[PDB]
């Protein structure tokens, strides 16, 4: 038993949102079996939208009543969800699950899909150099970052390389935050002080793999020694 979701990755506010939950391996004929939709905004808990039982029996949440519609098609074996009056605060990932009886609720879960609701467009990410202004305290090591801004949807992976195309293990990834209708995130990397006072390489390259452009800006190191 498995479930698969599908739908648009970008929808404008005050529009119609449609999602499809693809399941295969069972039929909604026996009693107790049902399908429900659960969403969870980032940093928040699960939210119950609606649940539909057999014999075309559907249930809706009073907090969201007269705003959602549940339709099922036995021919294609997939439930259709329609969302109207889209709001940026309602952005979340939607999941569907199957209930195998009256007591075993949501035994199998799918994978879900991120549906971003922003008035803006999927523009290319913008990189900005970051120069450390720390002074009078070298400490153990120093940090240098890379400001990936103006990206949508939030799907970015960071890799750090030296001038000679080396490999760096940073693993420092900060989550994105919605600011002014756009997602903003920052990525940093930790490097030993001894390596800085050595090779003549005075700059490193910041690389981001986003499906809107392959730009890569470089941050020049100030060098301390």
């Amino acid at each position: 038993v498995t479930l698969k979701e599908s739908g648009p990755t970008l929808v404008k506010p005050t529009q119609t949102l449609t999602l499809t939950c693809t399941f295969s391996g069972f039929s909604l004929t026996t009693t107790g079996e049902g399908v429900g939709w659960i969403r969870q905004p980032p940093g928040k808990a699960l939210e119950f939208l609606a649940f539909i039982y057999w014999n075309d029996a559907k249930r809706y949440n009073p907090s969201l009543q007269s705003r959602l519609t549940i339709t099922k098609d036995a021919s294609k074996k997939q439930v259709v969800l329609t969302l109207t009056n889209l709001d940026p605060v309602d952005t979340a990932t939607y999941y569907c699950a199957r209930t195998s009886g009256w007591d075993i609720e949501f035994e199998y879960w799918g994978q879900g899909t991120l549906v971003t609701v922003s008035s803006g467009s999927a523009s290319a990410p913008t990189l900005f150099p970051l120069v450390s202004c720390e002074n009078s305290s070298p400490s153990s090591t120093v940090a240098v970052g890379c400001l990936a801004q103006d990206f949508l949807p939030d799907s970015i992976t960071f890799s750090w390389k030296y001038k000679n195309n080396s490999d760096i293990s940073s693993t420092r990834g900060f989550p994105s935050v919605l600011r002014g209708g756009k997602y903003a995130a920052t990525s940093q990397v930790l490097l030993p002080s001894k390596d800085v006072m050595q090779g003549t390489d005075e700059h490193v390259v910041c690389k981001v793999q986003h499906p809107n452009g392959n730009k890569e800006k470089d941050v020049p190191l100030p060098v301390v020694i």
Binding site: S132, E134, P138, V142, V144, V196, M197, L221, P222, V223, V224, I225
Partner: protein
């Protein structure tokens, strides 16, 4: 992680009565760079065009507003070589720049 200045080369030599100990007498030569930035610097000794690869000890660079550093190096020399009017040159390499200073016993 303000300014860059070219290193200054200074060479110290023993006086006429600066040799002591059992014959042959030996002395030391001091080459120091001050008020130089960045920190890295290469110190080498040349004797009549021949590189010196032994008998020398260079102290670690220590801190003496632009940051400043100092470096002290000591090379052991023989009295006989000094009396032969040999020329000692201190080689300083700094950011790809080479500075040479020539000293001798001649007035």
């Amino acid at each position: 992680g303000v300014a860059e200045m070219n290193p200054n080369v200074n060479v110290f030599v023993p006086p006429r009565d600066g040799f002591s100990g059992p014959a042959p007498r030996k002395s030391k030569l001091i080459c120091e760079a001050t008020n130089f930035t960045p920190k890295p610097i290469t110190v080498s000794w040349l004797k009549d065009g021949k590189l010196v690869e032994s008998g020398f000890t260079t102290d670690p660079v220590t801190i003496e507003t632009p940051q400043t550093y100092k470096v002290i190096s000591t090379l052991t020399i023989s009295e006989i070589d000094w009396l032969n009017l040999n020329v000692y040159t201190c080689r300083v390499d700094h950011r790809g720049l080479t500075f040479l200073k020539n000293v001798s016993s001649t007035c």
